[PDB]
Design a protein around this ligand. Structure first.
Ligand code: MG
Ligand code: MN
Ligand code: MN
Lengths: 91, 584, 191
């Protein structure tokens, strides 16, 4: 049932989940802040979307509503949070 | 960046602000596209007949930039405003977005497919009728094609989203339009039979194209099943009193709705449209204000305010139109290398009757060679050549015939008596001999037969439809040949465009294989490349955006190559490009 | 002496009743009280719409006995049709420019206004072949004044909103360009 997964993270953990998703045959969606535009994980996914426009980049990666909005408009079936940003966040 | 765009000056890239986005007051209403969608073309005709306001056809996407910007307006600029036009101007009868010179120009100079433009605009504009200028037997080419080629083009264009086909013959010859009209009817679309206006119906000294000629042509066109009668005034020759008289006589003759199309070359386009609105015209072709006037169509906002408190209003949301015109004003600045220059009303178009595209191309061809300083004598030669040919209708491609004949006659210093007496020795231009051989059809009143015998020498002259004498085209054979030439199996649109423009399509395919989809670049970047330290973002598809930054331009080596230091997607990439100026 | 009424607003707009048709009528009567030979209507910003032109000229011609002189600009692209509508209403003199210096913020072309009225009830009194011959000189000498030329000029119906005269438009653009406010010239027009 899953065909596309979003990673709500950055850096090496996003690339790790992208590699696992490609091995499992799923599509990958990246998110990135404006200050993270040159990150490798942005260019390692099938689709990348700017999130948290105008915010601080850490706050941009904590933009919960923007992340779900990107995941919904991209048609992602699931969200992998990785670690360190919203992985332990109940909300 | 290193070699410049072909055909324009190698100037630096100016910094441009983002084009202003309209603030629209959206009002939902059922458009003519919706009526064509559920009900048929006849219900669209009934909708036009029962509308008391005059309807508007936007020529911004085709004819306005064909006249002013040498047809160079790109899909990337259309895409930023297509949805705004579709939603903010639902009262538009149709949007002229295809046909004419757009098909050739996109492939040749813009390196984008006209089919791709049609698909993207159709997705962006679901509730707007799409209109193309169809040249009848020529379709979007300049030569003639067999009948099945024309029918296949109509089928593919109607399937890909063309709703209205404005079908005209360059000499108003109904045999070169009947089959196209029938194919458009068969494909469930609206066929617009078109009368090309020339001369002066209120001038008794020119009786070849008088009111009765247009009335007879009108009932002949209504004899075919064409839904709308179109009056095409390609040079802006229709005077306002003549407009009222002509439209009144046509409304007395036929029951079809009348669609008037004029240019504003003489500065009388608005008043001509108003006179036709008094006479009861149904639809008029307008352009947005920032791409109106001069050789283009009269302004849509201006025609709203011209008819604001009269008996018939213009059906448009004028505030939304002005908001869209802000965007058009901003994106016109991208096309400064293609501008004609200082413009003004010119009533000399009533004398030489040169259509605006023919005017610009004749000016370019006359100034490229060194005899352009007597362009007034060139225009007088054009007028006398038109009179010599028997006062022919001058539109694409017969305007090219008169233009090439006049260009030859002042290029090699000829005279009317020179051609009429000792013309059997000169090598005449090939467009003139093809016109006199009947490749463009049969003119009104026939050829100047003994003069025709001077032009044609030992070549075959045909007197019937040139499409009957056309070599047959098999679509499977052509498709297999094209699948050999290009590296994949082509679509029907690719096959049909390869038939009309074979070398142009193959050159476009080669440029696609070399440079890719350059249609996705913005117009300043498309025309000027990149400056040093500039950052650009190219969205190549949904979710993919290339971050490109030019860091350094290397000095040319002994082989003439420059190394350009790009930063693509954060990573340094060194691109080697041959500088054509140093020449190894 | 040409006593002149500066036209502004919109007589056919009921939401702007200060400059209505009665105001222009009483002003025309007051001007005819003075011994002025010709009543002039100055449309300095090209605000006179064609239906408004017909209505205003008709109501002035049934009010005063002076000949009417209409002067308008073509900035909205409606100058020729406004002149034609005033010609239907019986205007006597209209202000035109040569074709090479016409259009945009300038007056409508005299050649264009000849051909607009060529077969109507009222013709334009001009030798149009002679005027078309003069226009060649005028475009040739217009090429001398390239540094003083404005940019790409298109019809602009936004003059019906801000009602700037063309000279006022150019001077406000020059002021917005000399100081750092030119990126909000739309806000300047709304202001
Ligand atoms: Mg109607
Ligand atoms: Mn046209
Ligand atoms: Mn003035």
């Amino acid at each position: 049932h899953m065909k596309k997964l979003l990673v709500a993270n950055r850096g090496e953990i996003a690339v790790r989940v992208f590699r696992a998703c490609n091995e499992l045959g799923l599509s990958t969606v990246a998110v990135y802040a404006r200050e993270d535009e040159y990150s490798v994980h942005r260019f390692k996914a099938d689709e990348s979307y700017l999130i948290g426009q105008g915010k601080k980049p850490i706050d941009a990666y904590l933009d919960i509503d923007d992340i779900i909005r990107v995941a919904l408009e991209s048609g992602a079936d699931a969200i992998h949070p990785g670690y360190g940003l919203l992985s332990e966040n109940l909300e | 960046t290193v070699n410049g765009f072909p055909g324009i000056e190698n100037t630096e890239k100016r910094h441009f602000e983002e084009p202003r986005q309209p603030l629209l007051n959206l009002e939902k209403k059922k458009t003519a596209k919706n009526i064509l969608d559920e009900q048929g073309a006849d219900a669209v005709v009934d909708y036009v007949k029962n509308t008391k306001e005059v309807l508007l056809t936007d020529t911004t996407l085709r004819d306005a930039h064909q006249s002013l910007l040498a047809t160079r307006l790109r899909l990337q600029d259309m895409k930023g405003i297509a949805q705004a036009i579709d939603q903010g101007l639902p009262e538009l009868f149709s949007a002229e977005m295809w046909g004419g010179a757009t098909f050739d120009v996109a492939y040749r100079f813009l390196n984008e497919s006209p089919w791709y433009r049609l698909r993207k605009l159709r997705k962006l504009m679901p509730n707007t009728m799409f209109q193309m200028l169809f040249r009848g037997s020529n379709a979007v080419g300049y030569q003639n094609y067999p009948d099945n080629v024309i029918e296949e083009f109509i089928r593919v264009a109607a399937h890909e989203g063309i709703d209205v086909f404005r079908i005209f013959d360059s000499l108003n010859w109904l045999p070169q339009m009947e089959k196209s009209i029938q194919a458009v009817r068969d494909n469930g679309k609206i066929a617009e039979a078109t009368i090309c206006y020339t001369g002066d119906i209120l001038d008794p000294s020119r009786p070849k194209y008088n009111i009765q000629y247009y009335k007879d042509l009108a009932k002949e066109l209504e004899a075919t099943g064409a839904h709308i009668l179109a009056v095409k005034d390609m040079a802006g020759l229709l005077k306002p009193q003549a407009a009222y008289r002509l439209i009144s006589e046509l409304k007395d003759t036929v029951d079809l709705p009348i669609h008037l199309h004029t240019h504003d070359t003489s500065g009388n386009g608005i008043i001509t449209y108003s006179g036709a609105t008094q006479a009861g015209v149904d639809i008029i072709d307008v352009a947005t204000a920032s791409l109106a006037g001069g050789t283009s169509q009269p302004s849509m906002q201006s025609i709203y305010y011209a008819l604001e408190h009269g008996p018939r209003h213009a059906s448009i949301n004028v505030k939304n139109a002005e908001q869209i015109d802000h965007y058009w004003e901003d994106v016109r600045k991208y096309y400064a290398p293609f501008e004609a220059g200082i413009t003004s009303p010119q009533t000399e178009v009533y004398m030489h009757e040169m259509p605006g595209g023919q005017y610009t191309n004749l000016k370019s061809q006359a100034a490229a060679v060194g005899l352009g300083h007597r362009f007034d004598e060139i225009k007088q030669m054009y007028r006398k050549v038109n009179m010599m040919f028997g006062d022919i209708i001058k539109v694409t491609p017969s305007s090219k015939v008169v233009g090439d004949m006049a260009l030859f006659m002042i290029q090699n210093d000829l005279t009317e008596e020179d051609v009429y007496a000792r013309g059997n020795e000169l090598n005449f231009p090939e467009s003139v001999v093809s016109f006199f051989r009947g490749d463009l059809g049969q003119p009104v009143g026939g050829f100047p037969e003994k003069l025709q015998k001077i032009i044609v020498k030992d070549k075959a002259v045909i007197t019937d439809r040139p499409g009957l004498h056309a070599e047959k085209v098999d679509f499977e054979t052509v498709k297999a040949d094209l699948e050999q030439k290009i590296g994949y199996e082509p679509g029907d649109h690719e096959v049909i465009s390869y038939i009309m423009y074979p070398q142009v399509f193959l050159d476009y395919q080669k440029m696609q294989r070399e440079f890719g989809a350059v249609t996705l670049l913005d117009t300043p970047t498309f025309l000027h490349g990149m400056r040093l330290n500039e950052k650009i973002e190219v969205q190549i598809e949904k979710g993919k955006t290339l971050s490109i930054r030019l860091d350094e331009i290397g000095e040319p080596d002994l082989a003439g190559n420059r190394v350009l230091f790009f930063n693509l997607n954060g990573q340094r990439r060194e691109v080697v490009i041959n500088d054509q100026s140093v020449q190894a």
